[PDB]
mmCIF file of C-alpha atoms and ligand atoms in Angstrom:
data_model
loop_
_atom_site.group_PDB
_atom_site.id
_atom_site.type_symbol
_atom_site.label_atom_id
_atom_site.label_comp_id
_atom_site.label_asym_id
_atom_site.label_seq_id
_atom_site.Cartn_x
_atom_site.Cartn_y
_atom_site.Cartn_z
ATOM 1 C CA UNK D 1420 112.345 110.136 100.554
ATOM 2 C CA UNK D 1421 110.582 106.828 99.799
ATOM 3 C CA UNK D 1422 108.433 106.401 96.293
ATOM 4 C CA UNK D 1423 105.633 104.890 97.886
ATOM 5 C CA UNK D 1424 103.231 106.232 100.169
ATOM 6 C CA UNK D 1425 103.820 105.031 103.944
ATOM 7 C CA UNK D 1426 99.990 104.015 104.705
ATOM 8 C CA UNK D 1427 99.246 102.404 101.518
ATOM 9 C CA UNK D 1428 101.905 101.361 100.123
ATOM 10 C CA UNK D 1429 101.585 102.819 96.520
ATOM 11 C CA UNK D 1430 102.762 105.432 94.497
ATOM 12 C CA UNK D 1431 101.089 108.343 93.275
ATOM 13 C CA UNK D 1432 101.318 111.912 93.941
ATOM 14 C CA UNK D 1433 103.478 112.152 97.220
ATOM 15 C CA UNK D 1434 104.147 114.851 99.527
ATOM 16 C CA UNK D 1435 107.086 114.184 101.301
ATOM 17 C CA UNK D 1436 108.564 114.880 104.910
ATOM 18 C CA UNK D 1437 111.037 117.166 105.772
ATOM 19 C CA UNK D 1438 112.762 115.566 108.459
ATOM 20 C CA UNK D 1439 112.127 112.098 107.654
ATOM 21 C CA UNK D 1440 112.123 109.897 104.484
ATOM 22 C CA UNK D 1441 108.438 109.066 105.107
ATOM 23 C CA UNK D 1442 106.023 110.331 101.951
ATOM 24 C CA UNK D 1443 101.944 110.307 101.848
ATOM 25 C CA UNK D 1444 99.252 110.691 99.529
ATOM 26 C CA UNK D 1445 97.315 113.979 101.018
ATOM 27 C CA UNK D 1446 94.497 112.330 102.044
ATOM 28 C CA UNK D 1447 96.241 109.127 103.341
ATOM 29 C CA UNK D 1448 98.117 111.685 105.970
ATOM 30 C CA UNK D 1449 96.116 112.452 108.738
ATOM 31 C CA UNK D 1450 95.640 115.102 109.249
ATOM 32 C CA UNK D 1451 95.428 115.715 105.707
ATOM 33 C CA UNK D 1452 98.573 116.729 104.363
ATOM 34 C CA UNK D 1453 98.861 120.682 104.902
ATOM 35 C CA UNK D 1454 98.689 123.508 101.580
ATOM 36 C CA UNK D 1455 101.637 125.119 102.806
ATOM 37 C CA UNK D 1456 103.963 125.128 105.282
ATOM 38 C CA UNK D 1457 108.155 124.899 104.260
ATOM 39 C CA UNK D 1458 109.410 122.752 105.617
ATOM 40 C CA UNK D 1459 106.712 120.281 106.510
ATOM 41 C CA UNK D 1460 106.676 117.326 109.184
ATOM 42 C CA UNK D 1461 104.562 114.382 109.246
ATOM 43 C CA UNK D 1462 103.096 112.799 112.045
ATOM 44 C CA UNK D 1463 105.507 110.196 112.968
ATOM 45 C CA UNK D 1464 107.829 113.298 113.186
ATOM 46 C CA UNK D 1465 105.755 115.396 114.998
ATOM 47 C CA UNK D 1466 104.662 112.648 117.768
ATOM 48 C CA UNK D 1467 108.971 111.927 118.092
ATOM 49 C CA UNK D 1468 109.080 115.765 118.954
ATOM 50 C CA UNK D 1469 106.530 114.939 122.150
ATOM 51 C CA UNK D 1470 108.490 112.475 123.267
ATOM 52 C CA UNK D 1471 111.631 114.037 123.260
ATOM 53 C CA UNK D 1472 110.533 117.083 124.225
ATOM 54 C CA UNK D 1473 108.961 115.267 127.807
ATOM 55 C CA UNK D 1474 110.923 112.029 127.873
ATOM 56 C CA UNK D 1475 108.685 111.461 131.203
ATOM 57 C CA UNK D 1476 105.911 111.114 128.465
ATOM 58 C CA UNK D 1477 106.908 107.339 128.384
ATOM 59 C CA UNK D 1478 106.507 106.220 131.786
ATOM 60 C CA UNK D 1479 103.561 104.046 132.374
ATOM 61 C CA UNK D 1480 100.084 105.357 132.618
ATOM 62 C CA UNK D 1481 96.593 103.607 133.478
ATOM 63 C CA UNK D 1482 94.825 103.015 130.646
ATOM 64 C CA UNK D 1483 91.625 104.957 132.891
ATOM 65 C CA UNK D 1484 93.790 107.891 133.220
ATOM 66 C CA UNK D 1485 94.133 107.854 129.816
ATOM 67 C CA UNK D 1486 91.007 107.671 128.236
ATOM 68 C CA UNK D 1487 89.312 110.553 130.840
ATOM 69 C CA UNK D 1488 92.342 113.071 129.236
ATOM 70 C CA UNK D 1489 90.576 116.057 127.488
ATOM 71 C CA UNK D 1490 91.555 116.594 123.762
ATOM 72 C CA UNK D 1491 94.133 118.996 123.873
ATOM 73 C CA UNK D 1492 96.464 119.390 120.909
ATOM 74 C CA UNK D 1493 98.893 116.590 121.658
ATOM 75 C CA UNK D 1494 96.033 114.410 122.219
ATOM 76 C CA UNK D 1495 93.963 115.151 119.143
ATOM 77 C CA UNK D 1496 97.542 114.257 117.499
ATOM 78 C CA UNK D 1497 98.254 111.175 119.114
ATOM 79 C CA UNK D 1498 94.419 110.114 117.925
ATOM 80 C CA UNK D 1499 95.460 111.186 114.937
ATOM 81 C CA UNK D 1500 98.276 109.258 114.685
ATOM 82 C CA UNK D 1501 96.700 105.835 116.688
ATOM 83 C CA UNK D 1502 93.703 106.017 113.485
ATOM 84 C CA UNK D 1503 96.808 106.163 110.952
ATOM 85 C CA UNK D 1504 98.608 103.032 112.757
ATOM 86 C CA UNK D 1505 94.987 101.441 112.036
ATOM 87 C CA UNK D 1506 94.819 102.422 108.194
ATOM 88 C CA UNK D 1507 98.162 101.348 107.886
ATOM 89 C CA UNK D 1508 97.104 97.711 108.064
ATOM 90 C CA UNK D 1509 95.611 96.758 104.876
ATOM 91 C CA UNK D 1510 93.114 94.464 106.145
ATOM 92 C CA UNK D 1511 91.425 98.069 107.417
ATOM 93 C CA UNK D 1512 89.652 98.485 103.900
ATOM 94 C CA UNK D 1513 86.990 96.338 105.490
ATOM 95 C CA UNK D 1514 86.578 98.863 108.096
ATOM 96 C CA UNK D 1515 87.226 101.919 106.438
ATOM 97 C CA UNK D 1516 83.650 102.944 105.096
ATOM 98 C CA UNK D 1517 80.353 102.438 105.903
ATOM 99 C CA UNK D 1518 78.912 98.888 106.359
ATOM 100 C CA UNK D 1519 75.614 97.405 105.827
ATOM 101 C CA UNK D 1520 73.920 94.393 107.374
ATOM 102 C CA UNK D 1521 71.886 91.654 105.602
ATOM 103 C CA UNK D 1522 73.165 88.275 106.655
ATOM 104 C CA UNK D 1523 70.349 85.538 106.912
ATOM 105 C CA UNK D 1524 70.712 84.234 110.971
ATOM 106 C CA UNK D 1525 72.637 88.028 111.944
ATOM 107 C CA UNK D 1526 71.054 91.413 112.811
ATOM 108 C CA UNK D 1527 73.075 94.741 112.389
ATOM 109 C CA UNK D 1528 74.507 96.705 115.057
ATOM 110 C CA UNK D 1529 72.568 99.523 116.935
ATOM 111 C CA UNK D 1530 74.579 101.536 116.508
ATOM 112 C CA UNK D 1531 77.302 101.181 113.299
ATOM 113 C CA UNK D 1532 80.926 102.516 113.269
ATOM 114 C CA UNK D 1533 83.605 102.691 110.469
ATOM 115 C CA UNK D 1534 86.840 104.470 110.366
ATOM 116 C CA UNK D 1535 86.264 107.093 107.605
ATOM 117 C CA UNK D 1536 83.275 108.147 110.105
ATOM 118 C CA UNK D 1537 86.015 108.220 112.865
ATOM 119 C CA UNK D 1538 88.728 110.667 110.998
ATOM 120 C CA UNK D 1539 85.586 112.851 110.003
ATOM 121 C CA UNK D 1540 84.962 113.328 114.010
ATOM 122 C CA UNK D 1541 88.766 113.777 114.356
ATOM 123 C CA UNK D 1542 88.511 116.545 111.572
ATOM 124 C CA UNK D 1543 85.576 118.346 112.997
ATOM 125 C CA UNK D 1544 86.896 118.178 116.644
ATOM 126 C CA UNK D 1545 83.397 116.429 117.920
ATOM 127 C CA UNK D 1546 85.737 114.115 120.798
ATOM 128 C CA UNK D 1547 86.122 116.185 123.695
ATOM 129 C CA UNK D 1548 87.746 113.458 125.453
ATOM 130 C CA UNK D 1549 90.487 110.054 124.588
ATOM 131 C CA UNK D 1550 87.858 108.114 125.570
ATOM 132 C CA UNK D 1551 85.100 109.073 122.684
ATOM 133 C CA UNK D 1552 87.488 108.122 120.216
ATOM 134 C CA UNK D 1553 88.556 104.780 122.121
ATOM 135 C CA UNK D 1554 85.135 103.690 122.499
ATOM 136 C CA UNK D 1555 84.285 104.575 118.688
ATOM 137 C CA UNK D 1556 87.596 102.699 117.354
ATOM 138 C CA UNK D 1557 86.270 99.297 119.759
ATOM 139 C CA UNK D 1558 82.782 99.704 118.655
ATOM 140 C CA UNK D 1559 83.660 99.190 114.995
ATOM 141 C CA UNK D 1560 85.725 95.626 115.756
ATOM 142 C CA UNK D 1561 82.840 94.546 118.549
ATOM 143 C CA UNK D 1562 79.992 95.355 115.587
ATOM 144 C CA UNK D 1563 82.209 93.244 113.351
ATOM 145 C CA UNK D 1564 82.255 90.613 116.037
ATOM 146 C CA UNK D 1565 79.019 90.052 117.188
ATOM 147 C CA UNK D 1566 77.249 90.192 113.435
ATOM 148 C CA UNK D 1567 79.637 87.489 111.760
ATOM 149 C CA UNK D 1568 78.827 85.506 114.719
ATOM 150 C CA UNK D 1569 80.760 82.448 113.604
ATOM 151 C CA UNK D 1570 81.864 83.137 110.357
ATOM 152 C CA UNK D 1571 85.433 82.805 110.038
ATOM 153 C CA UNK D 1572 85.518 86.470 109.373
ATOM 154 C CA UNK D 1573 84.809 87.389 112.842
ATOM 155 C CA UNK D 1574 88.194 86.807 112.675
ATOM 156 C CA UNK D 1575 89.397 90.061 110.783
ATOM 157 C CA UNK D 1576 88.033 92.119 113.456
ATOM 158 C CA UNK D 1577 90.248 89.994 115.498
ATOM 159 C CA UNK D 1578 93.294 91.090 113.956
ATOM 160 C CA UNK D 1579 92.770 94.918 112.969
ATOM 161 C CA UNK D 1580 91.661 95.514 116.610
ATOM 162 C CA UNK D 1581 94.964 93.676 117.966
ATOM 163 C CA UNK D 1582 97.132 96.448 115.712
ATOM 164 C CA UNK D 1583 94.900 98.892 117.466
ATOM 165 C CA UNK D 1584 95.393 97.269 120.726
ATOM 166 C CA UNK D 1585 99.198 97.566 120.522
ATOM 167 C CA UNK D 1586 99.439 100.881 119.019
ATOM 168 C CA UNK D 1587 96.500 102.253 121.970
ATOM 169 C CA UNK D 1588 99.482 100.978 124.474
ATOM 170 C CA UNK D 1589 102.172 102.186 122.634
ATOM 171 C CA UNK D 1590 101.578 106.100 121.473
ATOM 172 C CA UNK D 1591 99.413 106.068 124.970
ATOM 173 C CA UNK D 1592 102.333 104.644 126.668
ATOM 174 C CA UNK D 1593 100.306 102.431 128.430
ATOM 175 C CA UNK D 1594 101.648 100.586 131.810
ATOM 176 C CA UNK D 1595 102.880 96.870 130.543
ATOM 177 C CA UNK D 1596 101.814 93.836 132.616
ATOM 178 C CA UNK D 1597 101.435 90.130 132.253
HETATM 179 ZN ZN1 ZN G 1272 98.418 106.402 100.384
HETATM 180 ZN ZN1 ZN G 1273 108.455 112.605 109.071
HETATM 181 ZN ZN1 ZN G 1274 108.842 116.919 130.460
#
């Protein structure tokens, strides 16, 4: 297994996958890494096992299709796994818990978003649909958007919602075009 911890990139105390060098802090791990279970696999694992369980799974879909899908187990995981992608990126500690908004020229959002807020919805099940948890994952980089205004740290909402962007189409299997 690898030393460091596959979201954050340090060391600590590791739990480790058993079909797959990955390892994670507990709470890194979404979901949080489990008491028991021997042998134990992690979510990269676990979304593989999807796939090649329904290889069809990877056709193209329409992103509209996607996001009216009801939250049934493989898509509460694949959530799961998209908000991981996201917290992999270490320019996500700017979105990771809650913001506050006093910026002479700027107003906050109506309605603020951050990604520890998102997981905690994940945890307690509160998205009945793909769609709650798409809009909630935009909302956060569009907040971050329209209150930096034309700071150049609009543009780090830029960035961490392009890795969400590619990971959405990718896990989602989302239909490429030009
Ligand atoms: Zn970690
Ligand atoms: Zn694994
Ligand atoms: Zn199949």
């Amino acid at each position: 297994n690898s030393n460091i911890c596959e979201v954050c990139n340090k060391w600590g105390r590791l739990f480790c996958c058993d079909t797959c060098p990955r390892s994670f802090h507990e709470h890194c791990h979404i979901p949080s890494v489990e008491a028991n279970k021997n042998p134990w696999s992690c979510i990269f694992c676990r979304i593989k096992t999807i796939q090649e369980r329904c290889p069809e799974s990877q056709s193209g879909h329409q992103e509209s299709e996607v996001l009216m899908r009801q939250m049934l187990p493989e898509e509460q995981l694949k959530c799961e796994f998209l908000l991981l992608k996201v917290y992999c990126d270490s320019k996500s500690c700017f979105f990771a818990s809650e913001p506050y908004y006093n910026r002479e020229g700027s107003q906050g959002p109506q309605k603020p978003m951050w990604l520890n807020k998102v997981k905690t919805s994940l945890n307690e099940q509160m998205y009945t649909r793909v769609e709650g948890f798409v809009q909630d994952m935009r909302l956060i980089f569009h907040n971050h958007k329209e209150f930096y205004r034309e700071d150049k740290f609009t543009r780090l909402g830029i960035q961490v919602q392009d890795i969400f962007e590619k990971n959405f189409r990718n896990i989602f299997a989302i239909q490429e075009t030009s």
